[PDB]
């Protein structure tokens, strides 16, 4: 056990910092700024296809 020596270590600060990001995107006008698709064909996420 390996019951609380790691659970106090890693398993507790997971929920706190994820709350600090879900309460962050709706407030700050620049959230995560993820880039473009980089897609060579045309796929089902769009309606058209490419050869």
């Amino acid at each position: 056990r390996h019951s609380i020596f790691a659970f106090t270590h890693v398993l507790i600060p997971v929920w706190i910092i994820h709350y600090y990001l879900k309460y962050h995107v709706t407030t700050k006008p620049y959230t995560i700024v993820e880039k473009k698709p980089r897609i060579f064909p045309g796929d089902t996420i769009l309606e058209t296809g490419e050869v």
Partner: protein, 173 residues
């Protein structure tokens, strides 16, 4: 939150992963387990505050000012009329600072979006941002009278040079 016209970006356009292979991939084991170990300690407590934060409301109000004089009032050695004009001009400058910060991150919206092309597209932010900051240091930046803050006694007199020497001493414009 905010208004989307202030911060525009094109829509997201996320494609399909296209696995195509019968080999076992680890991405079908990660998103199917880790989502519930986050939603339970976060979202329910976020809901528990959501009913508790709606117990009472508190108000804070906008501050809108009053601007009766603008520039040319009044006579030289005065004090009274030349104090409100300072409150005019100086609060007409700290507004003009953070307007540029909107347009600065507007450039930053394009650059970390495309990335690959990033120069030959977006059609505005290399132009329009340079149609602001270029139209900024002239007559609104007291270069180098910004130390004494140039309060109504040099910010008009750069604009005296912007009308006397400029546009008439071009011989003959």
């Amino acid at each position: 939150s905010w208004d989307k016209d202030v911060y525009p970006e094109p829509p997201r356009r996320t494609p399909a992963p296209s696995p195509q292979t019968s080999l076992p991939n680890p991405i079908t084991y990660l998103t199917k387990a880790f989502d519930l170990l986050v939603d339970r300690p976060v979202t329910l407590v976020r809901e528990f505050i959501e009913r508790q934060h709606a117990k009472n409301k508190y108000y804070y109000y906008h501050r809108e000012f009053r601007r009766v004089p603008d520039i040319t009032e009044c006579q030289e050695k005065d004090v009274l009329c030349m104090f409100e004009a300072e409150m005019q001009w100086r609060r007409d400058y700290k507004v003009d600072q953070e307007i540029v910060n909107i347009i600065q991150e507007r450039l930053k919206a394009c650059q970390q979006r495309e990335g690959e092309s990033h120069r030959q597209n977006c059609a505005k932010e290399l132009e329009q941002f340079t149609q602001v900051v270029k139209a900024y240091q002239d007559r609104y930046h007291d270069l180098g009278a910004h130390y004494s803050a140039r309060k109504c006694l040099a910010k008009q007199k750069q604009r005296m040079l912007a009308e006397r020497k400029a546009a008439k001493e071009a011989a003959a414009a």
